[PDB]
Symmetry: D3
Subunit: 329 residues, 6 copies
């Protein structure tokens, strides 16, 4: 109907600046459900979406997104009605379509998952994509035989979004959680999240690439998939599983194959971007009861506002945010 | 009690002989159930276990085996009765304990699988470990979302032990089978098994590893790892799964992480050796019903007696066997 | 044989009398199981059964009841032993067979439901038919896609029998319960039962039959019917469901077929009278845990005695009783 | 990016044209996945989409469609690979977005359902919306207690699209199918489809409405609502269910509460337009095995090309077609 | 609403005679559903019911039956309609209430199972109570771990109804059937039913009771109690199960709990009389699908009329009938 | 490697003495997984095992145990890793193999269950065999239709190992526990465990035997068989089940057949010795939550040292110990 404040990235010949422009509903896509967002949208993927050079967004007249949980204002789709609390994440939001780092977002009804009862519009955005990735990781690991009795579970990339919540989700489930960080003195935070043991990054990758190097952990959530991941698989127990979804500290994995063939481990790829609806909705249902931790609000580092986002976008992608940041609109 | 004929390996200095010898029932360990076999087979592990350097057998005074299907003649374990048809496969047997390439075998009841009703002692041996490995592959893949109407499944290293049966198992299930072999003129044999299309090893890997190639197969049974697996993972469709279980064609797998994060594919490790009895019995039941191919006996290369075993162990090390050699006792 | 007090209705010439009189053990129907009732209740059907023009009872030498929950005394049926706590509800009881508004009742074993472990004889009568009808409503709705996250559920005719209990049952389950009533000042009572947001009867039906009104509620428990139902169906959210069970607002429902075709809603009919045993027992199991509210005793209007029910049968069929009147024996 | 043939509608003042025109690939929406469409897209909805006054198409520069089963040519969406057999049905497609009555169509990956392994591109279009609607009808019915033993299910408005296929799959499932039409001499055609008994339109409704009539059918697939549905609802057996989906024979249903409250009958509404992918994929998979009739091809009235279809679009609506007309591209 | 033929038993001169007497529709118990019985069956229980000393019928002038199948003539119960093919079996029928060995039978709707779709009215009475007793035996056995591959299953008294059908049901399911009969030459008949091995009573029990004997059978379907049952238990394999249902020659069973403690076998009791509707309906559906043998008509000894029943009731009890006899009405 | 303490049994001539002797790591069987046992081993089976004419231990190179729970210290078996907490129970342990009443015990990985998360090494040994046998009893009973609403469960031999924990296990699930004791003045002890009613042995078995006695219980845990069980079976409600497990006070059971054939009761055989890994892991998982009582530590009679075990072996057999004895190592 009228105008709103929006976080829009913009290209200047060869350079991207990221501005806070005032946009109307008329400029929003005419093929989606109009929703008052009110909450969040800032992740590591959005940090790359703001910085020039990162391989994410092509057409640049684009409002940054990835993550949105608000209320339906106007819907030309019978599947959704006025007053419906919905979560809009992933797919094309913030990649090729105007996302949720802004007041009001026109997102198709096919990507909208109704807000679970045991979660608020804030609580779902405390998770975000980093929370959904962590939950989908646990969901996929448990399909292959992850259970809290066959051994302790190691979570790399702790302190971060995916790893931090994955520690809390495993702790609520009942797993003995082992947290891995490159930052010391962070032990009195990961233990607060629910980690039984806090180890260094060297405790996972120091001896450098061995074929079969002693069983240590049952499962693994690994948002740090590189040379560390190749050494991680070598330390996994029999019938174990490792969930990837991470580009931190490496892109190439010099994996052997002996942990797979001889010790029956399974490397599982986690994609939050194009996850099917029936899987997506069922995961969000687990994030409300079965995998909803007593912590949740502890992984919150800053309650940032729409004005404080341009500076907070580069805080992630530099290890300045411990946990996750939420936007309020 | 009675004297029997056994195919036994023995290391003289630095050389392994392998000969047919007469052995009494007293020589067999008193631990476990005694089974009059009558029907065994030869795998790639059996050839390596019968030659110096094979890197499987440490203590060599040992009766080769891994794979047996016979009848219980005497049991101190109440779990099994005299007259029960059972399958002795994997765990130890032919590696560190006397196996089934012999008349009579002493194997603990914890490893014995009751012969499925829709399978004979012959048919269960046509499969063997190679059949169980192929079936466990399909079983693990379907746990990760393998479905006939989601794409044509690739079969790497066909005309082999595991690969040949995997073609037949996918065809009976309903999958469009795409078989890969470096051997030309073997396309006729693969189409008999149930391959809809026969491609070369070059079609899977020869343009050298990339990161994310054109989506082609959705899933793959991959008894040949190495650099071929690395290029295979990049060609898998969204939400796919790959089952390795074999390393005959390179050790190191230069994984690229991108198919895991972006395409959500999973690399599953299948170990037929120490696969739990819980899954083992369920897989063998599938090998009698839904995964039981109509061809089945087409996989049989030739019926081989215990005296003709020493020669056939050399044949599998070379490349004189196109199908699967079974040993009649 | 033992003499007991029984609420018996009699039709002299053309008028129903209704009085409590002494009936022997030998007078009760010979076929079936004998149960010392101890706890009964007052339903809207019971008032109709004890009044001329009610259209429920044909032959009029009858003991009223429709509802009973007591202990098995004499049993010729092998399915039930002496000391079994059971619930006698619906079928022919209080309609064409001697009901439960009496000490001792002969009810066949095919209608008896064993008392659930998390329910007492008093608690089972707090529900009665009205509680069972409200539970069977939710049970039928949830089979058709009713979820406590796809929207709010309307409970029309709240304060009554089915309505008041349905409010507390959906609230315990996790639904945001909207309650509709024609009685003001009862809003604080409905919020006490577990209703969030209290509306009038006109908020459901005042615009008078549109065909496709704005989507307002996910589902509906509607013991009202009539023209209100037709206005209700048009206001239902996509893929919703409406449970009937009542005729309070009228018999004719001028449906417009469009909410069924375009919105995909369903109009589910609930009949507590001849509900199958396997469904009946499964519903009572939910009434003991899944649907059992924290309030429960709040619905109880007044606990009445056996020689006081003739007045309670006059108190029912009126806007007097708020909730449920339980009978102590 | 070559030009293609397409059936495009255009208003031009006050008279819809509907004409075969040459449209380029560039004109198709960019957001969707490109599919070279094979086979049909003719339905009753498409006739109204090609007729003035039939309120379905708002913006009239539009390519008519609904139902399209082709092969993926190019995709930016990683969900689908080049060469995937897919079905594009309902949602938008031929109403607001460009449809599938044309060579090459752009449809987003959220609506594309992979072609079932037991179905071909022809067979999927033999079904269409009419096939999916009738299959969703019997799927929704069976969720409410529809079983072969309970009675002889009625299919009103047979001979048509939805009704004709509803008779076939219901017969395949095992039900005793009763079909009713408003025309004689088609009894041979209906008994060929799988109808056990052929009755007239007068047998269902002609003696005018009653509150509760003699129980007859148990279940009903009803693509002909109106006054016929209300009299049909009273002729339903205990615990029965009726599937709507069709508005022919009137859009006003004078239902009378009693079949719902006293017999436990449920009126289920089927919407093929916005059926979720979770159910859609499960229904399409049933249409390949569980609900795939031995006939199936008898429903096909005639096979038409892209040109000659404007006449076929005028043939529908006027009830000239017996079964379903298919296109070939 | 006039007269019919009925097989009735009277106690004139204080001794049972049994004849075929003409009985009106008014004479039947009015508290049930009136059903035109087409097809019945003579069971061993029917033999004692029409004989002095047989403790089944207490107070006489009663129509025998225990088994009935046919269509509903007139229903006072809303759950059933005119023309419903239904099976009346057990509970009080032919015991304390008028049975099914008669044209027209009034039986309450709580004891009526709707005829399974893959069964005709003739095929339903081929089973009768003895077929239900055999099926409930298999159903209870399979709940305790009775599996085709786990060993051979023994069937005692396979000449009769309960035994003969149990042989055919096990064979269709896949079990290795060992038939046990007191009479030879019936071996040819048993092998046609589906028995792989024929054995005399002596091989099962020829005196001498042991606490633990040699393991021979996985399980047992036993319609014969007494000392033979005790001899069977000691011969059952580990985790086995015995299904008891009869009394033919023996009432006391000298158990030793050694097969229960050391072998872990389970002694199951099968009562077809008061089996709950929940299980009863589920068992009858198995008798039409997975347990339905290809033979069926082989177990049929003779097909008699209603006036030929009095002689057929004396044919049973004296071991003359080789299987079951059907009564056409 | 190094020496430890073990409860060794030795038969010098014809006596059997049992001492605490020093045994090295190399003396243990070199085929199992080395586990430093932390807790317990005392059971009624151990008493007869260390006794002349006890008839459990055949040859005497044995160390006592049957029960063990500790941590894996070095493993050649790839299924288990050094640091895994496991329970070694039943099979050949303490009977034909070195048990768990010793520091460091060698046991093959096929018998080891991963310690349930909610159970400590002490808590798992508070249960032991006589506790797993009680849990398997409930698990087998519930498979035959044992539910809290059906009646009040009976427990014979309360005070003992199996019966004592059974009382607390049935009470946790919600069952009405009726416990039977040999000695009086021990009713308060069972009130602490969870028994609502405490009765004598005469209340179960006093007035000899009857074919069909009055129904009372529905289900019974029976670690005391013999003539008591035969009278117990006749006092079970319809569709009931009785779990054995014990030989205390009688081996022969003079049972009839009437409770089985007329009431549908089932005598279920529970063997904890060779219970498959499939069920064993599922039962232990229930013992950590579903069956885990609030008491648990109440059944602990007294802790003991490894040096004081020879005195504790004489403390059992005779009725001195009320509960279970734990050994700290």
């Amino acid at each position: 109907s009228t105008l709103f404040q929006a976080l829009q990235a913009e290209k200047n010949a060869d350079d991207v600046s990221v501005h806070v422009k005032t946009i109307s509903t008329e400029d929003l896509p005419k093929d989606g459900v109009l929703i008052k967002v009110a909450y969040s949208g800032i992740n590591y993927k959005d940090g790359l979406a703001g910085k020039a050079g990162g391989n994410i967004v092509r057409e640049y007249p684009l409002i940054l997104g990835i993550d949105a949980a608000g209320t339906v204002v106007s819907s030309n789709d019978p599947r959704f009605a006025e007053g419906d609390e919905v979560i809009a994440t992933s797919y094309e939001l913030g990649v090729s379509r105007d996302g949720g780092l802004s007041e009001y977002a026109s997102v198709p009804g096919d990507w909208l998952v109704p807000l679970p009862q045991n979660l608020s519009l804030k609580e779902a955005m405390v998770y975000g994509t980093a929370g959904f990735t962590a939950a989908l990781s646990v969901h996929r690991l448990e399909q292959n035989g992850l259970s809290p009795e066959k051994g302790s579970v190691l979570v790399t990339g702790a302190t971060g979004g995916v790893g931090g919540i994955a520690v809390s989700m495993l702790n609520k489930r009942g797993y003995d959680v082992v947290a891995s960080t490159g930052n010391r003195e962070a032990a009195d935070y990961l233990k607060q999240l629910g980690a039984s043991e806090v180890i260094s990054r060297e405790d996972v990758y120091d001896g450098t690439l061995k074929a079969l190097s002693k069983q240590q952990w049952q499962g693994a959530v690994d948002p740090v998939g590189g040379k560390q991941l190749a050494s991680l698989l070598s330390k996994i127990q029999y019938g174990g599983s490792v969930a990837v979804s991470g580009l931190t500290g490496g892109g190439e994995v010099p994996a052997t194959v002996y942990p797979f063939i001889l010790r029956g481990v399974s490397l599982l790829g986690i994609d939050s971007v194009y996850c099917p609806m029936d899987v997506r909705a069922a995961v969000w249902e687990r994030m409300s009861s079965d995998l909803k931790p007593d912590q949740l609000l502890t992984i919150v580092d800053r309650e940032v506002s729409l004005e404080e986002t341009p500076g907070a976008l580069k805080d992630i992608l530099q290890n300045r945010i411990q946990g996750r940041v939420i936007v309020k609109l």
